Amino acid sequence: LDLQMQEADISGYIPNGEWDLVGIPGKRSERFYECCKEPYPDVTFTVTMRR
Amino acid sequence: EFQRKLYKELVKNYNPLERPVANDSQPLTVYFSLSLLQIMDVDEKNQVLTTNIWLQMSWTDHYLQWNVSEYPGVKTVRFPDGQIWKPDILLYNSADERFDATF
Amino acid sequence: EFQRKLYKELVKNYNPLERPVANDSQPLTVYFSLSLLQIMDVDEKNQVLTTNIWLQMSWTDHYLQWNVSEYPGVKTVRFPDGQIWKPDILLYNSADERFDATF
Amino acid sequence: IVCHTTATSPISAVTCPPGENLCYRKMWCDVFCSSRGKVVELGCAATCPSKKPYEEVTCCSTDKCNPHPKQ
Amino acid sequence: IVCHTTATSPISAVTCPPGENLCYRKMWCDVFCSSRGKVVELGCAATCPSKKPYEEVTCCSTDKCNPHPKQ
Ligand SMILES: *[C@@H]1O[C@H](CO)[C@@H](O[C@@H]2O[C@H](CO)[C@@H](O[C@@H]3O[C@H](CO)[C@@H](O)[C@H](O[C@H]4O[C@H](CO)[C@@H](O)[C@H](O)[C@@H]4O)[C@@H]3O)[C@H](O)[C@H]2NC(C)=O)[C@H](O)[C@H]1NC(C)=O
Ligand SMILES: *[C@@H]1O[C@H](CO)[C@@H](O[C@@H]2O[C@H](CO)[C@@H](O[C@@H]3O[C@H](CO)[C@@H](O)[C@H](O[C@H]4O[C@H](CO)[C@@H](O)[C@H](O)[C@@H]4O)[C@@H]3O)[C@H](O)[C@H]2NC(C)=O)[C@H](O)[C@H]1NC(C)=O
Ligand SMILES: *[C@@H]1O[C@H](CO)[C@@H](O[C@@H]2O[C@H](CO)[C@@H](O)[C@H](O)[C@H]2NC(C)=O)[C@H](O)[C@H]1NC(C)=O
Ligand SMILES: *[C@@H]1O[C@H](CO)[C@@H](O[C@@H]2O[C@H](CO)[C@@H](O)[C@H](O)[C@H]2NC(C)=O)[C@H](O)[C@H]1NC(C)=O
Ligand SMILES: *[C@@H]1O[C@H](CO)[C@@H](O)[C@H](O)[C@H]1NC(C)=O
Ligand SMILES: *[C@@H]1O[C@H](CO)[C@@H](O)[C@H](O)[C@H]1NC(C)=O
Ligand SMILES: [Ca+2]
Ligand SMILES: [Ca+2]
C-alpha cells in the first residue's frame, strides 16, 4: 500500500470564534523495522492554531 | 438494462478481502488527502482535539473495469461498504470511544 | 393471496444498486421537499443548529409496476431499506457524529 | 564519516556532515513488535543521544557500523 | 461584451450589462477534486475580483474568453 499524500482543503472552513487557523500542512513519513527492509508509511497533518 | 448486466458481471467472483492488483508483488497506490470544515473543540482537561473532516481516498481497482461502448450510458457504479475492497486507513491517535469516527 | 404472488414477482431479479430507469442514459427525477416541526437548539459555542425535520423524497421506479386488475385489492406495497433503491440524498453540512440522522 | 540513515527510503548510505562523527541506531518495541519487530532509527549525531528507558542504542565511530539487522 | 456564465444551466452565453466589461472565471478544488475536478464559476464583473489563497482566476476583456475547459 504505497500511500501518497496530496494537499489538504480549506475551501469549506468555518471559523468558530475562539481559534484562528494558521495552517494545516502535511508530511509523509516512513518507519523501518527489524523484520525486513520494506518501509511502513504514514501521513501526518499538523493543525496549527492561535487563540 | 445494461446496469443489471454490469453489476452481475462485476461481482461474479469478486472478493472484498483481496487487494485489487494484477500482480500481487507490485504495490497498490493510494492517494490520501483531507478536507477540514471547522474546529469543534480543543479540550485541555482530556487533551483532545475535536474536528470535522472529510477524508479523501483514491485508488485503482483492476477487477472493476468495463467497456463503455458495450454498456451505453453506464459511466459509473457505486458499491456499499462490504461489497468491495477499501483500504484500512485510520487515525492512529484516535480518542473517540469507537475508534473509527467515519460514516 | 395476491400479495404473496406480487411480492415474489417484484423481487424476481431486482437489484437495489441499480438506478431504476428504463433508459440508463436518461435521468431519474427526484422531488425533494421538507417538513420542519420545531427548533431544538441554536448553540453559538459549537456553531450548531439542532432541528427536527421530516424529509420527503418522491421518485418513479420502472421495475416496480403491476396491473391492479390482476391483483385485486393490492394497491400498494412497502419495502424496507435494503430491498429497493433509494437515492443518496444527505446533508452536506451535517455535524451529527453519525452523519445520517435519519430513521 | 559515512553513516546509514532511515530518513531516506530506500535505506541509504548518506555521507555525514562535519561535526558529527558517530553513526548511531535506536531500537524499541512499538505496538507491532510481535510481527514487525522493533523499530529502527539510523543516523549520524554529534554525540550519541540519550537512551530512554524503553529505547536501546548501539553507538559506533566507524563507517557503516550501523546497518539494518538483515545486513 | 458577451460573457459566459454559470448561474444559467445549461451554460449560457449571456450578454453582460453595462459597467462590467471583464469576463472572468474562478476555479478551485472542492472535496470532489479527484473525480469531478476543480469547480468552475463564470461571469462578468466590474473589475475581476480578489483571488483567495485556494482560488485561481483567469481574467479576460474580450467576448467569450472564459469558456468551460472542454470548449
Ligand atoms: C510469521 O510471524 C512470526 C512472528 O512474527 C515469525 O516468527 C517469529 O520470527 C521472529 C523473527 O525471526 C522471531 O524472533 C527471533 O527470535 C529468536 C529467538 O528468540 C531471536 O534469537 C532472534 O533474534 C533476532 O532479533 C534480535 C533482536 O535484538 C537481534 O539482535 C538478533 O541478531 C536476531 O536478528 C529473533 O528475535 C520470533 O521468535 C518468531 N516467533 C514468534 C512467536 O515471534 C515467523 O517466522 C513468520 N513466518 C514467516 C513464514 O515469515
Ligand atoms: C476515471 O477517473 C479518473 C480520475 O478521475 C480519470 O483519470 C484522470 O483524468 C483526469 C482528467 O483527464 C486527469 O487529470 C489530467 O492530468 C494531466 C496530467 O497531470 C493534466 O495535464 C490534465 O490537465 C488538464 O487539467 C488542467 C487543470 O488546470 C487544465 O489546465 C489543462 O488544460 C487540462 O485540461 C488533467 O489535469 C488525471 O491525471 C487522471 N488520473 C487521475 C489519477 O486523476 C479517468 O480518465 C477516468 N476514466 C474514464 C474512462 O473516464
Ligand atoms: C510480477 O512482479 C514481479 C516482480 O517485479 C515480476 O518478476 C520480476 O520481473 C522483472 C522483469 O520486469 C525482473 O527484472 C525481476 O527480476 C523479477 N523478479 C522476480 C522476483 O521474479 C513478475 O514478472 C511480475 N509478473 C508478471 C506476470 O508480470
Ligand atoms: C436512450 O437514450 C438515448 C439518448 O437520448 C437515445 O439515443 C438518442 O436518441 C435520440 C432520438 O430520440 C437521438 O436524437 C439522439 O441522437 C440519440 N443519441 C444517442 C447518443 O444515441 C436512445 O435511443 C434511447 N434508447 C431507447 C431504447 O429509447
Ligand atoms: C471495447 O473497447 C475496445 C477498445 O479497447 C473497442 O475496440 C471495442 O469496440 C469496445 N467494445 C465494443 C462492443 O465496441
Ligand atoms: C392489465 O392492464 C391492461 C391495460 O393496461 C388491461 O387491458 C388488462 O385487462 C389488465 N389485466 C387484466 C388481467 O385484465
Ligand atoms: Ca476548552
Ligand atoms: Ca444557546
How far apart are the C-alpha atoms of D38 and D67, rounded to whole Å?
14
**Cis ω on the peptide bond leading into residue D69 (within 30° of 0)?**
no
How far apart are the C-alpha atoms of A33 and D35, rounded to whole Å?
10
Task: Please list, in sequence order, all residues whose beta carbon lies within 8 angstroms of the beta carbon of residue E48, skipping any fewer than 6 positions away.
Answer: E22, E24, E57, E59
How far apart are the C-alpha atoms of D4 and D62, rounded to whole Å?
11
CA of E28 to the centre of ligand 2 (A): 15
| The pairing of beta strand B29-43 with beta strand A2-9 | parallel
CA of C75 to the centre of ligand 6 (A): 15
Long-range contacts of C77-83 (CB under 8 A, 24+ apart): C77/C3, C77/C6, C77/C7, C77/C10, C82/C16, C83/C11, C83/C14, C83/C16
- Residues of A within 8 A of B40 (CB-CB) are 16
Query: Please, are residues B28 and A2 in contact by the beta-carbon 8 Å criterion?
Result: yes
Q: Does residue C51 sit in helix, strand or coil?
A: strand
Query: Please, are residues C24 and B77 in contact by the beta-carbon 8 Å criterion?
Result: no
Positive/negative CA dihedral, C71, C74, C75, C76: negative
Whose CA is closest to atom 13 on ligand 5? B70
Q: How far is CA B48 from the centre of its chain?
A: 27
Question: How many residues comprise chain D?
Answer: 71
Compute CA distances B68 → B2, B7, C22, C27, E36, whole Å: 10, 14, 18, 18, 18
Please report which helix (H) or strand (E) contains residue C79, including its range: none
Identity of the amino acid at B102: T
Ligand whose nearest atom lies closest to the CA of B73: 4
In terms of C-beta density within 10 A (0-12 exposed, 13-18 middle, 19 or more buried), how is residue A33 classed?
buried
Query: Please, are residues E45 and E22 in contact by the beta-carbon 8 Å criterion?
Result: yes
In terms of C-beta density within 10 A (0-12 exposed, 13-18 middle, 19 or more buried), how is residue D71 classed?
exposed
Residues with CB under 6 A from ligand 6: C 67, 69-70
Task: Please list, in sequence order, all residues whose beta carbon lies within 8 angstroms of the beta carbon of residue D63, skipping any fewer than 6 positions away.
Answer: D1, D2, D3, D23
- CA closest to B40 among chain C residues: C46
Other Cβ atoms less than 10 A from the Cβ of C13: the count is 9
Name subunits touching B (3+ CB pairs < 8 A). A, C, E
β-pair partners for C38: C52
| The pairing of beta strand D56-57 with beta strand B29-43 | unpaired
CA of C24 to the centre of ligand 2 (A): 25
> Using CA atoms in the order D9, D36, B87, B32, what is the torsion angle rounded to 10 degrees?
-30
**Inter-chain CB proximity B35 and A9 less than 8 Å:** yes
Query: Please, are residues B77 and B9 in contact by the beta-carbon 8 Å criterion?
Result: no
Other Cβ atoms less than 10 A from the Cβ of B102: the count is 12
Please indicate the experimental technique that yielded this structure: cryo-EM
β-pair partners for A49: A21
How far apart are the C-alpha atoms of B47 and E34, rounded to whole Å?
34
For B4, phi then psi, to 5°, come to: -55, -50
How far apart are the C-alpha atoms of B49 and B68, rounded to whole Å?
46
Residue with cell 433508459: C23
Question: How many angstroms away from the CA of B44 is the closest CA of chain E?
Answer: 30
- Residues of A within 8 A of D9 (CB-CB) are 30, 32, 39
Other Cβ atoms less than 10 A from the Cβ of D55: the count is 15
How far apart are the C-alpha atoms of E10 and A22, rounded to whole Å?
39
How far apart are the C-alpha atoms of C71 and D9, rounded to whole Å?
70
Whose CA is closest to atom 26 on ligand 3? B23
Q: What is the DSSP string of B50-103?
A: EEEEEEEEE---SSS---TTTSTT-------GGGS-------TT--SSSS----
Question: How many angstroms away from the CA of A6 is the closest CA of chain D?
Answer: 19
In terms of C-beta density within 10 A (0-12 exposed, 13-18 middle, 19 or more buried), how is residue C58 classed?
exposed
How far apart are the C-alpha atoms of D40 and D6, rounded to whole Å?
8
CA of D22 to the centre of ligand 2 (A): 48
How far apart are the C-alpha atoms of C58 and C89, rounded to whole Å?
12
Query: Please, are residues C77 and C9 in contact by the beta-carbon 8 Å criterion?
Result: no
Nearest to D21 by CA among D35, D1, D40, D38: D1
DSSP-derived secondary structure letter, D60: -
Instruction: Label residues B21-38 b or e (16+ Cβ within 10 Å = b).
Output: beeeeeebebebbbbbbb
Is there a binding annotation on residue B19?
yes
For residue C80, what is its C-alpha cell?
A: 424496507
Query: Please, are residues B71 and B2 in contact by the beta-carbon 8 Å criterion?
Result: yes
Nearest to B50 by CA among C46, C76, E27, C55: C46
Nearest to C6 by CA among C92, C85, C67: C67
- Residues of A within 8 A of B19 (CB-CB) are 1
Q: Is E71 in the pocket of ligand 2 (CB under 6 A)?
A: no
**Cis ω on the peptide bond leading into residue D10 (within 30° of 0)?**
yes
Q: Does C47 touch chain A (CB under 8 A)?
A: yes
| The pairing of beta strand A40-45 with beta strand E41-45 | unpaired
Ligand whose nearest atom lies closest to the CA of B76: 2
How far apart are the C-alpha atoms of E57 and E25, rounded to whole Å?
6
How far apart are the C-alpha atoms of D21 and D16, rounded to whole Å?
8
- CA closest to E55 among chain A residues: A11
Is there a binding annotation on residue B21?
yes
Reported resolution in A?
Answer: 3.0
> Using CA atoms in the order A6, A10, A11, A14, what is the torsion angle rounded to 10 degrees?
160
How far apart are the C-alpha atoms of D45 and D56, rounded to whole Å?
16
How far apart are the C-alpha atoms of A39 and A34, rounded to whole Å?
11
Residues with CB under 6 A from ligand 5: B 67, 69-70
The torsion region of residue B13 among left (phi > 0), alpha (psi -120 to 50) and beta comes to: alpha
